[PDB]
Design a protein around this motif. Structure first.
Motif, mmCIF file in Angstrom:
data_model
loop_
_atom_site.group_PDB
_atom_site.id
_atom_site.type_symbol
_atom_site.label_atom_id
_atom_site.label_comp_id
_atom_site.label_asym_id
_atom_site.label_seq_id
_atom_site.Cartn_x
_atom_site.Cartn_y
_atom_site.Cartn_z
ATOM 1 N N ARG A 2 41.546 35.452 21.021
ATOM 2 C CA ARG A 2 40.194 35.536 21.673
ATOM 3 C C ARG A 2 39.898 34.242 22.349
ATOM 4 N N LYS A 3 40.756 33.232 22.101
ATOM 5 C CA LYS A 3 40.494 31.928 22.744
ATOM 6 C C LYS A 3 41.610 31.550 23.595
ATOM 7 N N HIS A 4 42.618 32.418 23.685
ATOM 8 C CA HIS A 4 43.733 32.389 24.601
ATOM 9 C C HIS A 4 43.305 33.049 25.869
ATOM 10 N N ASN A 5 42.768 34.293 25.719
ATOM 11 C CA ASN A 5 42.170 35.111 26.708
ATOM 12 C C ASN A 5 41.072 34.443 27.483
ATOM 13 N N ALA A 6 40.271 33.836 26.614
ATOM 14 C CA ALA A 6 39.151 33.010 27.038
ATOM 15 C C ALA A 6 39.493 32.033 28.152
ATOM 16 N N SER A 7 40.372 31.070 27.916
ATOM 17 C CA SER A 7 40.878 30.082 28.843
ATOM 18 C C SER A 7 41.478 30.661 30.110
ATOM 19 N N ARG A 8 42.262 31.787 29.959
ATOM 20 C CA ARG A 8 42.931 32.407 31.130
ATOM 21 C C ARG A 8 41.901 32.947 32.074
ATOM 22 N N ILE A 54 47.784 34.619 40.476
ATOM 23 C CA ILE A 54 46.882 34.560 39.306
ATOM 24 C C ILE A 54 46.286 35.901 38.922
ATOM 25 N N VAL A 55 45.422 36.404 39.795
ATOM 26 C CA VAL A 55 44.771 37.672 39.591
ATOM 27 C C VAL A 55 45.648 38.873 39.289
ATOM 28 N N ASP A 56 46.817 38.879 40.003
ATOM 29 C CA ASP A 56 47.809 39.856 39.881
ATOM 30 C C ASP A 56 48.547 39.799 38.472
ATOM 31 N N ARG A 57 49.029 38.628 37.963
ATOM 32 C CA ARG A 57 49.848 38.407 36.836
ATOM 33 C C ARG A 57 49.078 38.542 35.561
ATOM 34 N N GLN A 58 47.732 38.516 35.680
ATOM 35 C CA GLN A 58 46.763 38.596 34.567
ATOM 36 C C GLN A 58 46.320 40.012 34.377
ATOM 37 N N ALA A 59 46.628 40.907 35.396
ATOM 38 C CA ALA A 59 46.449 42.321 35.326
ATOM 39 C C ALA A 59 47.690 42.787 34.604
ATOM 40 N N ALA A 60 48.809 42.040 34.607
ATOM 41 C CA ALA A 60 50.002 42.336 33.952
ATOM 42 C C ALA A 60 50.056 41.753 32.582
ATOM 43 N N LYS A 61 48.960 40.991 32.198
ATOM 44 C CA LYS A 61 48.721 40.665 30.800
ATOM 45 C C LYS A 61 47.664 41.627 30.256
ATOM 46 N N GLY A 62 47.136 42.498 31.162
ATOM 47 C CA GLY A 62 46.196 43.518 30.871
ATOM 48 C C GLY A 62 44.775 42.999 30.749
ATOM 49 N N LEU A 63 44.523 41.774 31.235
ATOM 50 C CA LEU A 63 43.284 41.019 30.895
ATOM 51 C C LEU A 63 42.263 41.201 32.003
ATOM 52 N N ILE A 64 42.612 41.983 32.982
ATOM 53 C CA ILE A 64 41.620 42.489 33.934
ATOM 54 C C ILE A 64 41.194 43.871 33.471
ATOM 55 N N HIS A 109 40.313 44.953 41.284
ATOM 56 C CA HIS A 109 39.847 43.583 41.180
ATOM 57 C C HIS A 109 40.779 42.711 42.022
ATOM 58 N N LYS A 110 41.691 43.307 42.853
ATOM 59 C CA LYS A 110 42.416 42.571 43.891
ATOM 60 C C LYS A 110 41.790 42.958 45.196
ATOM 61 N N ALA A 111 40.772 43.859 45.175
ATOM 62 C CA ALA A 111 40.044 44.318 46.388
ATOM 63 C C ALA A 111 38.603 43.805 46.342
ATOM 64 N N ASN A 112 38.134 43.392 45.198
ATOM 65 C CA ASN A 112 36.822 42.955 44.995
ATOM 66 C C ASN A 112 36.607 41.555 45.500
ATOM 67 N N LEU A 113 37.748 40.818 45.479
ATOM 68 C CA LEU A 113 37.685 39.415 45.818
ATOM 69 C C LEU A 113 38.298 39.131 47.210
ATOM 70 N N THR A 114 39.083 40.115 47.719
ATOM 71 C CA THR A 114 39.448 40.303 49.067
ATOM 72 C C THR A 114 38.098 40.410 49.858
ATOM 73 N N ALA A 115 37.072 41.110 49.290
ATOM 74 C CA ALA A 115 35.857 41.575 49.987
ATOM 75 C C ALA A 115 35.100 40.435 50.569
ATOM 76 N N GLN A 116 34.992 39.361 49.785
ATOM 77 C CA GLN A 116 34.356 38.170 49.941
ATOM 78 C C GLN A 116 34.581 37.537 51.203
ATOM 79 N N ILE A 117 35.799 37.275 51.551
ATOM 80 C CA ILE A 117 36.210 36.483 52.708
ATOM 81 C C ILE A 117 35.975 37.205 54.017
#
Lengths: 205, 80, 80, 85
Positions: D16-22, D55-65, D73-81
């Motif tokens: 819970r504090k590993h996840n936290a930092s990531r 980052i965003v991509d490899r953390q979806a592969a840790k399942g943490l998205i 959540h690779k389209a949500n932050l695309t939106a911004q720019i």
RNA sequence: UGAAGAGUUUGAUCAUGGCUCAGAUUGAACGCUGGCGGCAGGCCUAACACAUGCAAGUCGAACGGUAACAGGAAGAAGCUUGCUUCUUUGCUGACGAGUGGCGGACGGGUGAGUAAUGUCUGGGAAACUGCCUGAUGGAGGGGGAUAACUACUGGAAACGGUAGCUAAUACCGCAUAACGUCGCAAGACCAAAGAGGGGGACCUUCGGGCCUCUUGCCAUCGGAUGUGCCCAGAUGGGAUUAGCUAGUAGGUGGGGUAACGGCUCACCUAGGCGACGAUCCCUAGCUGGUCUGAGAGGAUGACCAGCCACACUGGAACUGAGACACGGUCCAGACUCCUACGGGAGGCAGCAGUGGGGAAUAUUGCACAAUGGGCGCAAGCCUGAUGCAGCCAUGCCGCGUGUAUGAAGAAGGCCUUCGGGUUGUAAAGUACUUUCAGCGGGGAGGAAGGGAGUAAAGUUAAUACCUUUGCUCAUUGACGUUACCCGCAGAAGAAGCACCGGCUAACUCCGUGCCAGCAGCCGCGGUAAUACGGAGGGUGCAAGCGUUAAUCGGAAUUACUGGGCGUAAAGCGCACGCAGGCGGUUUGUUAAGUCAGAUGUGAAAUCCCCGGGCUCAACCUGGGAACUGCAUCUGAUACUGGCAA
């Protein structure tokens, strides 16, 4: 209860015998019958309506040995069939093992017929029973056992059997102590003291 | 979760079993998905005390759901 | 096919939202007499322009705002 | 108190504090893009978009998205720019 | 295959109308009484508080290991000498603990809360889904760790701190990058885990590499299943509850969720809701169903099934497909307990038990046999789920407590012009029977499986292994000497309870004397009581009987079915009129209401129709019909409604 008391005293105020210690005796033979069973706890008069109306309800009730519940239940199967309610009831009442045996000459008394089935001396088919009610049906086989072609009580009830017509819807064999209950009862000829219309009014609320 | 299983519906000291596909999160007597069979372990001669289908023990076992040992041994003896 | 449900606007003011009252024949249960049991639902107009008596088509869907699940699918007619 | 694996509680202290930092490393990088959006820049908002893109991509592969957020959540932050463009 | 009334107001009578009784029922209680057995049920209240015990683990086949047990080897002893004994060693069985994975989010219990985007019925759309399963493709190469352990060191315990070491299907990079994802596009970007058995040819520094199989792992797109989310409609009562609402109503754009949403926000608009009953107040878990009832209806929600909600109180978050985890954590609070007085610990609405409450509701029992559930590729282990046993007439059902015969009809009673009558075939007396209990002795069955061998007709190595197949063998039974069956004497061991004035079947004799007392109602008793008390007798039910409470019925006495209003209970003192209800007559149109058909669905259970299985019955059970209903799809146009004329 199965009673166990003074059979013939009932006859008095029954106004009929209905087979109370039949074998040598019936009404006014060595007994006081056709009186009132009280001194003046009960004595003869004109009778009430409701008297009759209760008594006859019990008439039908007592010559099978059926309890309170049972006979009503039979009524709840009759008035569930879409055939004749009157017929159906007296049909179900004769399915009791105790009644069938008497009418195969086994037992000189109704009570005795039912007191046979008690002691292990009865059986139906290859099945042994000691149950005074059974499902008795077309082409069943009523069977005496080994050590019941040995008892001297059974034989002594064949006497009276020669003296009662025995029904025509059953075979009866006394010579090997069998007989089959080959087909359904007739009551075209036993409703001769039974008015079904009376009792079924009362049962109704 | 759902599994093929047996399921008493007998009374006391009567083992009448019914093969059901039923849940492990409810029970074998709880939420059923479906019946699928009847079974006698005592091998009674009553009217249809043995049923086990072909069609649902060949469709819900397609997407997986395991049967029981008596059943396993019954597939052969109805020669299905 | 689809289902679109006949309502009548009866309160339009707010921007991009029309209040509709839908009257269907409800029967009494024990006394078996039909009656009008009016029931507002909150329909989203694409642009508000309605008012009062405008028969409309609505249909069941996803929300777009809170207490929504309804859209305008067509204006049958108007009466404002 | 008695549990079979009441150690489960301690094990989760770790996870819970590993996840936290990531996640909070991921949240500092989202703040870095937003910096550049208020500068009007395509040259520092995009030193913070393609740099959190693995980052965003490899953390979806840790399942943490997690779940259908992680196809979103690779389209949500695309939106911004894209507003700024 | 389907429903009956009686009594009770009055001097008499007919209505009106209340009252009472006869029915059926219960998770029922009570009083008395009590032979067996089969099937079912059994804390409804203080959701009050609880001693203790148990109910939640398992994989070594991911690990690093060896604490114990037992062997293997090894040196050794005793030469207690080829046999006892001692140390060594993870080698092997096997496994303490510790790392790692999965369960502990289930199952179980309770109904306190809860009038409910909670439940039920019927739809819907923008989702999730570990365990499950299909297809295709992959599993490449590195690094940093840290438990145990070890050496120290703190506390009464709980429970620690240093310092050092190390493993992995643990951790983190890096590589590879679609039928991937994101991106209009151009493009950009992201994955890992192996472990087991076996083996012929080769190789090895001899641990292994090589090879083959097997399970497990990674990715991508599906399917299944199970689960979120929305909607409509139905869901209790009170207007001596009429006014309500600021993320309130809506709109933009931000943000958030798995997903749709004021879910949340910034801004903007100033709306929204309400008597077709808002708001508030009372009470309640909800449903299939249940009970009763001819039905409609009312009442109801026990066991059983489904749903929902809750776990000392309150609050809160973590990991995860799943939790706000009953027996997980933390924080606050009140309890409660311990203490080395410094400090800690705990939460039976889980089972069994405890105390207190209450009218009332059972044993800290036995067991993995069997059924199901969990972990594990298996073996195997785990289970207050379960199967059994136990306690209780709480109920439903079955059988028994003997049969026959026997009279001047026995004494012994009781009543009696004193002739007798009644108890009474009842007894005595005679034969006849031993069910069931009791005793002795057998005993089916519930067991399929797994385990030791062998066949393969797969796969590869041709052989293995692994899986498969039949066969072969030794066995799997908790209940409990089970169902049942045989023998053994001997009527033996086995009846009670209420009532008898009228409704209501069923009285005499005494004692009492409007006293005693009785009593559901109407009502009893003032010294010749069919009503009080005893006795005698009679009556109805019977291992039960009677009383009460309680719900429906009768009661059509709240009435849609199925009610009244001149005088019996009821018509505003009288007009006006808003909402509401209601609409002459003809034509055209529509098809909403309506009629028809079709299609889903209407859980299992339950009813019924037909039909079986237990020694019968109780009980068990199959198939059909029912599932009255609802939504959907298409037609019809007479009537009802809309529109037009």
């Amino acid at each position: 209860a199965r009673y166990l008391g003074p059979k013939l005293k009932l006859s008095r105020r029954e106004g009929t015998d209905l087979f109370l210690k039949s074998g040598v005796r019936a009404i006014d033979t060595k007994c006081k019958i056709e009186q009132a069973p009280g001194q003046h706890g009960a004595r003869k008069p004109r009778l009430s309506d409701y008297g009759v109306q209760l008594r006859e309800k019990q008439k039908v009730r007592r010559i099978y040995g059926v309890l309170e519940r049972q006979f009503r239940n039979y009524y709840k199967e009759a008035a569930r069939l879409k055939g004749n309610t009157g017929e159906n009831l007296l049909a179900l009442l004769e399915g009791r093992l105790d009644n069938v045996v008497y009418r195969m000459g086994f037992g000189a008394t109704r009570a005795e017929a039912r007191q046979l089935v008690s002691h292990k001396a009865i059986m139906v088919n290859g099945r042994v029973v000691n149950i005074a009610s059974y499902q008795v049906s077309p082409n069943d086989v009523v069977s005496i056992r080994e050590k019941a072609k040995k008892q001297s009580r059974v034989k002594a009830a064949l006497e009276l059997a020669e003296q009662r017509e025995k029904p025509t819807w059953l075979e009866v064999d006394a010579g090997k102590m069998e007989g089959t209950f080959k087909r359904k009862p007739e009551r075209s000829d036993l409703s001769a003291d039974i008015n079904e219309h009376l009792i079924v009014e009362l049962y109704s609320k | 979760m759902v599994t093929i299983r047996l399921a008493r519906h007998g009374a006391k000291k009567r083992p009448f079993y019914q093969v059901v596909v039923a849940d492990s999160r409810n029970a074998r007597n709880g939420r059923f998905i479906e019946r699928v069979g009847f079974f006698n372990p005592i091998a009674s001669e009553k009217e249809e005390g043995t049923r086990l289908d072909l069609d649902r023990i060949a469709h819900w076992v397609g997407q997986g759901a395991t049967i029981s040992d008596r059943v396993a041994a019954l597939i052969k003896e109805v020669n299905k | 096919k689809i289902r679109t449900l006949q309502g009548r606007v009866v309160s339009d003011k707010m921007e991009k939202s029309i209040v509709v009252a839908i009257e269907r024949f409800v029967k009494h249960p024990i006394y078996g007499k039909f009656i009008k049991r009016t029931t507002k639902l909150h329909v989203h107009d694409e642009n508000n322009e309605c008012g009062i008596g405008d028969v409309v088509e609505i249909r069941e869907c996803r929300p777009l705002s809170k207490t929504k699940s309804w859209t305008l699918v067509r204006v049958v007619e108007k009466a404002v | 108190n008695i549990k079979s694996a009441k150690k489960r509680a301690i094990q989760s202290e770790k996870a819970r504090k590993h996840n936290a930092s990531r996640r909070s490393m991921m949240r500092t990088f989202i703040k870095k893009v937003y910096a550049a959006i208020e500068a009007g820049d395509k040259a520092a908002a995009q030193k913070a978009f393609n740099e959190m893109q693995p980052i965003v991509d490899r953390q979806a592969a840790k399942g943490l998205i997690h779940k259908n957020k992680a196809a979103r959540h690779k389209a949500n932050l695309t939106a911004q720019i894209n507003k700024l463009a």
